[PDB]
Amino acid sequence: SELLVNTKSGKVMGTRVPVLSSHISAFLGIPFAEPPVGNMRFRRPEPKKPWSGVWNASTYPNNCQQYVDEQFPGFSGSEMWNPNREMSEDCLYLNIWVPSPRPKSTTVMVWIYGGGFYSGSSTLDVYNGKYLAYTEEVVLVSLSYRVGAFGFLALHGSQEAPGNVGLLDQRMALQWVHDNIQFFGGDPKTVTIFGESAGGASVGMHILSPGSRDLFRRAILQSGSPNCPWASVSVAEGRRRAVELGRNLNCNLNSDEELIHCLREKKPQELIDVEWNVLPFDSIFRFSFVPVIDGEFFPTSLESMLNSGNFKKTQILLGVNKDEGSFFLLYGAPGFSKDSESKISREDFMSGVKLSVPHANDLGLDAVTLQYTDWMDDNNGIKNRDGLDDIVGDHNVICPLMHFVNKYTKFGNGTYLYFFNHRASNLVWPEWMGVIHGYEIEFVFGLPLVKELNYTAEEEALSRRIMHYWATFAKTGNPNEPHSQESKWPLFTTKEQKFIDLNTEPMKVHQRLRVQMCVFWNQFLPKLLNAT
Amino acid sequence: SELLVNTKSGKVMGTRVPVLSSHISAFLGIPFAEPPVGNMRFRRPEPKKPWSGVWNASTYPNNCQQYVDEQFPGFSGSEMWNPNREMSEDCLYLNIWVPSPRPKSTTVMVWIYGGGFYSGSSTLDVYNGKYLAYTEEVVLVSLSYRVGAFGFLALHGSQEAPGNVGLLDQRMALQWVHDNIQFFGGDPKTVTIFGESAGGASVGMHILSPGSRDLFRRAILQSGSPNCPWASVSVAEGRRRAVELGRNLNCNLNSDEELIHCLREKKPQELIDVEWNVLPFDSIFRFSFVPVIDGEFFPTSLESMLNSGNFKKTQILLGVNKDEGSFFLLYGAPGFSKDSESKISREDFMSGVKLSVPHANDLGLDAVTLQYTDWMDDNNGIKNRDGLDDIVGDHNVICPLMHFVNKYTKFGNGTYLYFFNHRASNLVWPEWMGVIHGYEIEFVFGLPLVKELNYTAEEEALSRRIMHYWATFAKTGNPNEPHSQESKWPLFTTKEQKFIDLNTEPMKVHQRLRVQMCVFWNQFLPKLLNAT
Ligand SMILES: O=C(Nc1cc(COCc2cn(CCNC3=c4ccccc4=NC4CCCCC34)nn2)ccn1)Nc1cccc2c1[C@H]1CCCCN1C2=O
Ligand SMILES: O=C(Nc1cc(COCc2cn(CCNC3=c4ccccc4=NC4CCCCC34)nn2)ccn1)Nc1cccc2c1[C@H]1CCCCN1C2=O
Ligand SMILES: *[C@@H]1O[C@H](CO)[C@@H](O)[C@H](O)[C@H]1NC(C)=O
Ligand SMILES: *[C@@H]1O[C@H](CO)[C@@H](O)[C@H](O)[C@H]1NC(C)=O
Ligand SMILES: *[C@@H]1O[C@H](CO)[C@@H](O)[C@H](O)[C@H]1NC(C)=O
Ligand SMILES: *[C@@H]1O[C@H](CO)[C@@H](O)[C@H](O)[C@H]1NC(C)=O
Ligand SMILES: [Cl-]
Ligand SMILES: [Cl-]
Ligand SMILES: [Cl-]
Ligand SMILES: [Cl-]
Ligand SMILES: [Cl-]
């Protein structure tokens, strides 16, 4: 009865799941779009046709087709991010966790997974929504969206492969939540969208895009922002990559209709096998098929939108991890496995700089090199490793986010900024990698509350603190409970630019998160590359 | 009799002067050139015609015509650098201090004064050679040379005003020493030239110039080097400045002969009154009439000469002071007078950067600003002052010298590098100015040995140490006394790049003198300006 819900698309039947010696309701694999298959591959999503009968929503759905990571077969640290369900183009489903008994109209949080817009699943163990839903009494939704060429092949002008359809998949799940979440006890007027990495970029993209703004109340962005250098391409570059993808499969390249028709007849794994070939350079933290600045989903360039205040004005909470770049270098820079601690020579540093800033001319490479080299000690393998670590994280995550946060805060209605710098006591990655891209997620989702996962008592308390900040922000637009005695997370303002650390120590307030390097990345280096 | 010397130019009569608790011989105002007056203005020097009778060399000669500093009238700190004798175009004389009794063939040191190539005198109290000559038993010579337009007006292709004649004055005094110093007890095979600021650039220029190399044995350069950005100009820029000097004086500009003839009719002070007007930019640490890269004194560009080893190969000793920039900012950046300790707003920082790197485009100015700004704390008046202080000293003095050191050491026969960072206990300048441009000279010349000047006894010991380093280097090409128990001043090498501090504390060896900023000034910013 609790598990039986009549929606505007049909009746659904959920399942009762255990969580921390109690139970809650889960509705898994609810369809929100027509399967984007056959002649609908690369097309805008269509609403799911209402069904008769009872949709069985007790099991996780398929994951979208995607490149599977085989760098470290069997290693939990990488396997925890891979699809744990069968892959299929039939993947546009959402999941809902509902406190029990069902609330009347409580706060809703909607998760958007990351994965560079080429990978990701709503069904990962680390996205299990039951702990956050139970502990904070929120309705927790996780959506899905098409990735890779299936989500972001962009032949602008064509209505058959317009680009950005994976962003429209997300918007369609948000529309479904808007129309139906009230029947699961959720308040459609108090929906917070949150996501990490490409999920965080996505969240920012919905803040910008006029067509998405009314489908949510406020936003949380983790280690990602819409202006990230890897998160979008021009319509020309998207067109170039789509054609290059056809060339890699010996397709007729004479017309969009011919190219698209050829691509629609390849098996999914055939597109995935060639996906990495269309990139313009050898590079790390670059992805083949990503959103396009199309003049439709994004009316103008992201910078002009940010400059003019052309975005949803609300409250945002956002932040970064200390070592965003480490796993990208381990995976993509060969020098990082010549040494057990990944100390690297000066030659490998220079090579890595080229791989990490692939768009820079030779003068920009020197500028990057000079900014991150200790010329008193340039053969120090540790300083070389750490310098290139910072380059990757600053360029791709931290400084784009700081640019976004300063532009947004001029027009928005409240900004809260964090710096997550706790290394989990049970981490399986080597210590030099630090606080890795993605490893705040398990704290946000409450995993340290599970005794058998072997976190410390301090880490359970940190997880509880973070979940409550997140939910209280979702509920009120402010992560703090005023009237409490706890330390207060202060607003980020244009003038004082305050942020807090998130770790196991008592709260610290700082100002101007990595301002020195982000002036280099956000102001000086683009001016240098614009000059030459 | 000891005071009577027969030279190849005629007999000279010197004077016995007291030094400390003893006495020494001095031969003051010996002419080495025909007075460059009348039609000889701007012309290459001519050897002094031998005289009959006895030249009375018992008093200091006139100083050359020059801009007199009146910024702080009566203030000892600035007046100690102004002419203390009458100014005259009849100024090509030299001074010699000779130990008593006369040595048979002792080490010779020849002093070349600085002053931006637009000022300077051989007769300043701080250049009194008697202490060094007495204490170290060397024959000490100080020369003079024409400064300003008189010495460096350059209309290339003209034989009436060819440029570089002030350097040819220096060379002709060196030739006089070569021909005659044996008659004063000096060894002409063991002559060291040394000078500070423009005198140090000059010393460097005789190392480069083939017509000078055989007139000295080894070289000492203090706070100056031949490649400094203020120390030379192209022939085109020298010609532009000379023409602009005529324009300022309503001269006929139709030809070199007419321009020169007009210029030769003006009183010296009329040239000096308009000297600063020919500079191409508003600037500090830039001077109007300086050596020209002419293809004769300098056969090719300084950089190509340095790169190919086209220079005298011998031993050099050289170094810099801690705060080369400070008095240039006091004099020329009005922000340094708004506040007692010269705290500097951000606006005045940015203006000073423009004044200090006047040749840079906007991208280069931003590069400089970024490199010297603490963006966590950009309104700190102390940090802004110190940052602009370091900009001026690094750009104009320290990093040019480091570039010269590294090029020279690839081909030379022994390099010794120092960093002078003692602030005299009796300094009359405010504390923020630190170790000022020129204030190591008084230690080199042994003024702390004079009790009436209220130096500390530890500063006397430091002066004695430096005089002994300098003279021992002049005598042997190594500042260290062999078979000694003191710590050794190490050779500077391409690989280890060692230098010492000069101060009252025990000797410390360091490596890579200001390498971080000098990579910026010597490698990156030039590449940036060349490319953009
Ligand atoms: O040319 C290319 N480029 C290319 C670039 C990548 C991007 O590598 C970084 C990356 C990886 N992932 C998914 C992992 N998931 C996550 C984590 C995983 C570990 C730790 C933290 C994590 N945090 C996460 C947070 C967010 C979620 C996702 C997270 N995302 N980004 C991948 C593949 N190919 N590949 C190519 C082409 C031809 C041959 C080869 C290769 C490459 C294939 C791989 C190297 C060896 N290769 C070949 O032999
Ligand atoms: O007008 C100029 N420059 C300019 C520079 C001066 C002289 O200032 C530096 C100087 C002075 N001295 C003789 C002192 N003797 C010494 C010391 C004296 C004190 C402490 C240590 C000492 N150590 C010594 C070691 C060596 C020997 C000599 C030493 N030498 N250098 C005069 C006039 N004009 N640039 C320019 C051009 C166009 C527009 C603008 C500007 C600027 C400047 C005007 C405001 C903003 N500006 C513009 O709008
Ligand atoms: C729904 O699916 C689950 C898992 O396959 C199954 O246990 C349950 O009985 C199903 N309910 C139906 C088919 O009514
Ligand atoms: C948010 O908006 C309300 C309504 O205009 C305003 O009163 C409040 O000051 C704003 N707060 C912030 C932090 O911008
Ligand atoms: C040398 O010149 C000085 C200064 O005019 C003078 O006092 C001295 O008597 C002269 N000595 C001679 C002419 O022998
Ligand atoms: C100086 O030259 C001599 C002669 O070739 C050589 O033996 C000596 O090693 C050189 N010293 C330096 C420091 O270059
Ligand atoms: Cl198919
Ligand atoms: Cl680290
Ligand atoms: Cl626990
Ligand atoms: Cl705490
Ligand atoms: Cl005259």
Side-chain angles (χ1 to χ4, degrees), chain A residues 1-450 452-532, chain B residues 1-450 452-507 509-532:
Chain A
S1 161
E2 210 180 5
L3 305 183
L4 195 59
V5 178
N6 193 24
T7 81
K8 293 178 174 158
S9 301
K11 311 191 254 172
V12 302
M13 166 78 70
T15 179
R16 189 148 175 99
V17 307
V19 46
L20 303 171
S21 299
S22 188
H23 300 77
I24 60 171
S25 311
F27 301 87
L28 307 174
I30 303 182
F32 64 86
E34 285 294 300
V37 302
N39 71 291
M40 290 174 71
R41 175 192 288 174
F42 312 122
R43 223 177 264 181
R44 290 182 178 89
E46 298 298 331
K48 170 72 173 180
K49 262 121 79 177
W51 61 87
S52 65
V54 175
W55 191 281
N56 190 344
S58 60
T59 270
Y60 269 145
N62 301 312
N63 304 137
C64 295
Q65 294 280 353
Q66 57 193 265
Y67 184 91
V68 174
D69 175 13
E70 290 175 23
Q71 182 69 76
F72 302 114
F75 182 58
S76 62
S78 48
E79 295 289 352
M80 70 175 283
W81 307 103
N82 270 335
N84 57 341
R85 291 307 187 271
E86 253 171 79
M87 297 188 288
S88 170
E89 288 184 284
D90 187 352
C91 60
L92 296 185
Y93 299 83
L94 56 80
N95 313 296
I96 313 179
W97 288 267
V98 183
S100 182
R102 189 188 299 170
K104 287 285 179 69
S105 67
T106 193
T107 292
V108 172
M109 302 176 70
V110 181
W111 177 252
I112 306 179
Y113 57 70
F117 294 111
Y118 79 87
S119 60
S121 301
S122 62
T123 65
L124 304 183
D125 290 345
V126 74
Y127 306 155
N128 191 337
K130 71 181 181 184
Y131 307 107
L132 188 52
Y134 172 83
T135 300
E136 294 296 317
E137 302 237 46
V138 301
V139 170
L140 194 51
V141 183
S142 59
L143 53 72
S144 69
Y145 63 98
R146 287 173 275 168
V147 290
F150 312 89
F152 297 100
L153 192 89
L155 292 168
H156 189 241
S158 173
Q159 299 301 320
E160 292 301 327
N164 297 330
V165 301
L167 290 172
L168 297 170
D169 298 341
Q170 300 175 14
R171 176 188 289 167
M172 173 111 84
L174 295 186
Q175 183 71 58
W176 195 93
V177 168
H178 177 263
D179 300 342
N180 295 288
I181 203 68
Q182 70 197 70
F183 308 121
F184 300 84
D187 178 9
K189 296 160 99 327
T190 315
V191 172
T192 288
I193 52 164
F194 69 136
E196 187 268 350
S197 194
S202 287
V203 162
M205 288 168 174
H206 293 295
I207 287 172
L208 285 162
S209 180
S212 292
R213 293 182 197 159
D214 292 312
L215 294 177
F216 66 99
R217 181 63 175 287
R218 46 184 62 104
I220 300 178
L221 296 80
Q222 302 162 206
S223 297
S225 68
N227 56 313
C228 282
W230 48 267
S232 70
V233 296
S234 69
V235 287
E237 177 61 6
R239 175 162 290 280
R240 186 195 71 76
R241 300 186 184 181
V243 169
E244 184 66 28
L245 181 75
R247 182 179 291 103
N248 275 271
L249 299 155
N250 298 320
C251 283
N252 196 314
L253 309 179
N254 282 322
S255 66
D256 293 342
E257 291 80 13
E258 275 164 320
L259 173 59
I260 294 169
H261 179 95
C262 178
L263 295 174
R264 290 191 170 149
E265 297 198 349
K266 299 306 158 64
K267 296 195 181 89
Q269 200 54 46
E270 282 183 271
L271 308 183
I272 293 166
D273 284 344
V274 287
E275 178 189 327
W276 298 100
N277 307 341
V278 311
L279 280 173
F281 320 92
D282 305 310
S283 54
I284 72 167
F285 225 136
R286 291 303 184 268
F287 313 107
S288 290
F289 295 98
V290 299
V292 278
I293 310 300
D294 63 344
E296 186 166 41
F297 194 93
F298 310 94
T300 63
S301 72
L302 304 175
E303 184 70 8
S304 40
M305 295 184 72
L306 293 173
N307 278 341
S308 66
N310 189 9
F311 48 81
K312 184 188 180 76
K313 281 108 161 197
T314 183
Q315 305 85 34
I316 58 171
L317 182 154
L318 73 172
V320 299
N321 292 357
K322 174 174 134 286
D323 301 283
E324 304 285 11
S326 48
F327 101 87
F328 294 90
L329 294 153
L330 176 61
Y331 270 58
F336 277 72
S337 4
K338 302 179 190 167
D339 174 85
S340 55
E341 292 155 32
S342 301
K343 303 165 174 146
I344 56 162
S345 69
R346 194 74 205 152
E347 295 93 314
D348 274 330
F349 177 90
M350 291 172 57
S351 173
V353 171
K354 171 65 151 183
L355 291 172
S356 306
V357 198
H359 55 293
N361 66 15
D362 178 74
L363 178 76
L365 298 179
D366 292 347
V368 176
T369 296
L370 171 65
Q371 190 79 191
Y372 285 86
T373 299
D374 178 4
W375 280 114
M376 267 164 54
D377 192 13
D378 52 311
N379 287 315
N380 183 316
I382 286 179
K383 290 181 182 167
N384 283 335
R385 180 200 68 204
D386 292 348
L388 192 54
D389 219 322
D390 288 331
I391 287 170
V392 178
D394 291 340
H395 173 57
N396 291 289
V397 174
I398 300 183
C399 296
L401 187 136
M402 293 314 294
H403 186 67
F404 173 80
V405 76
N406 277 285
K407 295 287 180 185
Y408 187 88
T409 299
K410 299 217 178 56
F411 296 92
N413 191 232
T415 298
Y416 297 90
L417 182 60
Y418 71 80
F419 184 76
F420 182 86
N421 64 348
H422 176 77
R423 182 177 163 95
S425 71
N426 52 9
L427 213 83
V428 299
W429 296 95
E431 232 179 333
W432 74 262
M433 298 182 66
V435 187
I436 292 158
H437 196 62
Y439 278 83
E440 90 293 351
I441 292 182
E442 55 200 60
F443 282 84
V444 171
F445 277 83
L447 267 61
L449 278 61
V450 187
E452 56 259 42
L453 290 184
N454 277 327
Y455 293 89
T456 64
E458 305 89 284
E459 286 168 324
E460 167 177 8
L462 173 59
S463 181
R464 291 189 180 272
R465 193 162 75 105
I466 284 173
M467 288 190 292
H468 198 54
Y469 286 146
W470 262 231
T472 301
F473 172 80
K475 170 184 195 156
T476 70
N478 180 337
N480 302 290
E481 245 163 9
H483 317 148
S484 87
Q485 208 266 302
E486 308 301 317
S487 319
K488 296 304 187 288
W489 183 345
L491 280 163
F492 176 101
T493 60
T494 299
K495 189 201 198 66
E496 301 209 271
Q497 294 166 57
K498 301 190 180 163
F499 67 97
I500 67 164
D501 294 332
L502 291 173
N503 59 38
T504 54
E505 294 171 338
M507 171 188 304
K508 298 189 184 65
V509 178
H510 312 280
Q511 297 178 263
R512 302 195 177 184
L513 181 33
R514 269 184 90 83
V515 60
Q516 193 74 32
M517 295 304 104
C518 290
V519 177
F520 172 81
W521 288 104
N522 294 338
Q523 294 165 226
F524 176 75
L525 185 66
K527 192 172 174 156
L528 182 154
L529 298 172
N530 200 28
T532 28
Chain B
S1 159
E2 192 175 34
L3 300 168
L4 215 49
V5 173
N6 193 23
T7 83
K8 293 176 174 162
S9 303
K11 310 177 86 160
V12 299
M13 159 108 69
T15 184
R16 192 152 175 82
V17 316
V19 46
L20 300 171
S21 284
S22 186
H23 292 83
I24 204 188
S25 307
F27 302 82
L28 305 180
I30 296 174
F32 61 87
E34 284 298 300
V37 308
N39 270 135
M40 293 174 78
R41 183 186 285 170
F42 311 122
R43 231 182 263 166
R44 293 185 173 94
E46 293 299 323
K48 175 68 176 185
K49 295 163 186 177
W51 58 83
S52 58
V54 177
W55 191 279
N56 179 350
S58 66
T59 68
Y60 271 149
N62 298 319
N63 307 134
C64 296
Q65 293 286 357
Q66 61 192 263
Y67 186 83
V68 177
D69 170 25
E70 302 179 9
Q71 184 61 64
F72 301 113
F75 179 62
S76 64
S78 61
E79 298 290 359
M80 70 173 283
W81 305 104
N82 278 336
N84 57 347
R85 290 312 189 272
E86 244 172 6
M87 292 190 291
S88 177
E89 288 182 280
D90 182 6
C91 64
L92 297 183
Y93 298 81
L94 56 81
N95 313 294
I96 312 181
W97 292 265
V98 184
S100 184
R102 187 188 296 174
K104 289 193 168 221
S105 187
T106 196
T107 299
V108 176
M109 303 178 71
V110 177
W111 175 250
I112 307 177
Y113 57 72
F117 295 109
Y118 79 85
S119 63
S121 301
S122 72
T123 62
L124 302 189
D125 293 342
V126 80
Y127 304 159
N128 192 335
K130 62 183 189 181
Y131 312 108
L132 185 51
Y134 172 80
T135 300
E136 293 300 314
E137 281 299 280
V138 299
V139 167
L140 190 44
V141 183
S142 62
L143 55 75
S144 63
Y145 63 99
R146 285 169 279 173
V147 296
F150 310 92
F152 296 100
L153 192 87
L155 290 162
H156 184 244
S158 161
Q159 296 310 313
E160 291 306 310
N164 293 336
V165 302
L167 287 168
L168 293 171
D169 296 340
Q170 297 175 15
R171 178 187 287 166
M172 209 155 77
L174 296 180
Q175 176 78 236
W176 197 91
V177 170
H178 174 84
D179 297 342
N180 294 286
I181 205 65
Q182 73 198 76
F183 308 120
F184 300 80
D187 179 9
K189 280 169 77 46
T190 311
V191 170
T192 290
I193 55 178
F194 68 134
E196 186 265 356
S197 200
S202 291
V203 162
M205 287 165 169
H206 297 295
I207 289 171
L208 288 161
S209 177
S212 295
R213 293 178 194 158
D214 293 317
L215 295 181
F216 64 99
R217 178 72 167 276
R218 49 186 59 104
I220 298 179
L221 302 75
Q222 302 168 202
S223 303
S225 68
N227 55 311
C228 286
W230 47 267
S232 61
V233 293
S234 65
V235 298
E237 175 65 9
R239 173 170 290 281
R240 188 198 71 72
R241 295 188 191 186
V243 171
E244 185 67 25
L245 190 77
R247 186 177 279 113
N248 271 270
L249 294 165
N250 287 314
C251 285
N252 188 325
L253 312 185
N254 292 341
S255 67
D256 292 349
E257 282 291 313
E258 281 170 308
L259 168 56
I260 291 163
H261 188 280
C262 171
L263 288 177
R264 283 180 173 153
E265 293 303 322
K266 308 299 184 179
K267 288 159 164 164
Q269 204 51 46
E270 303 177 73
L271 306 183
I272 293 164
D273 284 339
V274 298
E275 175 181 341
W276 297 101
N277 305 348
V278 309
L279 283 169
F281 314 111
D282 301 327
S283 59
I284 65 158
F285 221 135
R286 292 294 185 268
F287 319 106
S288 285
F289 300 97
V290 300
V292 276
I293 312 301
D294 60 348
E296 306 153 63
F297 198 90
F298 309 99
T300 64
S301 78
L302 305 182
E303 187 67 12
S304 57
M305 294 184 71
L306 285 179
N307 280 338
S308 62
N310 192 5
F311 48 80
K312 184 189 184 64
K313 278 100 176 198
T314 181
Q315 305 83 40
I316 59 177
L317 182 151
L318 73 176
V320 300
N321 296 358
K322 177 164 125 300
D323 302 281
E324 304 282 12
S326 55
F327 104 86
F328 293 89
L329 292 157
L330 178 57
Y331 272 61
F336 287 66
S337 304
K338 292 173 185 161
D339 193 279
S340 47
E341 293 177 350
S342 297
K343 288 143 118 170
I344 287 310
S345 82
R346 192 79 204 146
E347 173 190 280
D348 281 350
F349 179 89
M350 289 173 70
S351 304
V353 170
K354 176 70 152 173
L355 294 174
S356 298
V357 198
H359 55 291
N361 60 16
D362 291 332
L363 184 63
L365 295 179
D366 286 341
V368 178
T369 297
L370 178 62
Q371 193 74 197
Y372 285 83
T373 300
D374 178 2
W375 282 113
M376 299 181 62
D377 192 11
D378 50 309
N379 292 316
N380 186 322
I382 295 199
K383 289 180 174 166
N384 288 335
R385 183 201 68 202
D386 286 350
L388 196 55
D389 210 331
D390 284 329
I391 284 168
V392 179
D394 291 346
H395 169 58
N396 290 294
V397 177
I398 297 190
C399 295
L401 186 141
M402 291 315 295
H403 182 74
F404 174 79
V405 164
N406 282 288
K407 294 302 185 177
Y408 188 87
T409 294
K410 312 273 196 60
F411 297 87
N413 190 235
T415 297
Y416 298 89
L417 180 63
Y418 70 85
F419 179 79
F420 179 83
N421 63 350
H422 179 73
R423 186 180 153 98
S425 64
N426 52 11
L427 222 79
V428 296
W429 292 104
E431 242 196 323
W432 74 259
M433 295 180 78
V435 187
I436 296 157
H437 193 68
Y439 276 82
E440 90 294 351
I441 299 174
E442 57 205 57
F443 286 83
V444 165
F445 278 79
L447 269 62
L449 279 59
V450 183
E452 305 88 303
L453 302 177
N454 336 85
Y455 286 93
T456 76
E458 293 83 355
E459 287 166 329
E460 154 165 3
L462 173 64
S463 180
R464 282 178 189 278
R465 261 181 70 217
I466 283 163
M467 285 191 296
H468 196 54
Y469 286 144
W470 267 227
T472 300
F473 170 83
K475 179 194 215 156
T476 75
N478 182 336
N480 301 294
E481 214 156 9
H483 319 326
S484 171
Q485 296 160 252
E486 322 294 326
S487 323
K488 300 306 181 97
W489 181 345
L491 277 169
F492 177 102
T493 55
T494 300
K495 184 183 180 181
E496 296 182 60
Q497 296 171 236
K498 292 173 173 178
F499 66 101
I500 65 160
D501 296 339
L502 286 176
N503 55 44
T504 58
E505 293 166 11
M507 171 191 305
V509 176
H510 319 268
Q511 285 177 268
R512 303 189 166 188
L513 181 35
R514 276 182 78 81
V515 62
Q516 190 73 29
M517 296 302 95
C518 292
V519 175
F520 174 82
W521 288 106
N522 295 341
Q523 299 186 53
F524 176 76
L525 185 63
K527 185 162 179 186
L528 180 150
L529 293 180
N530 188 35
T532 66

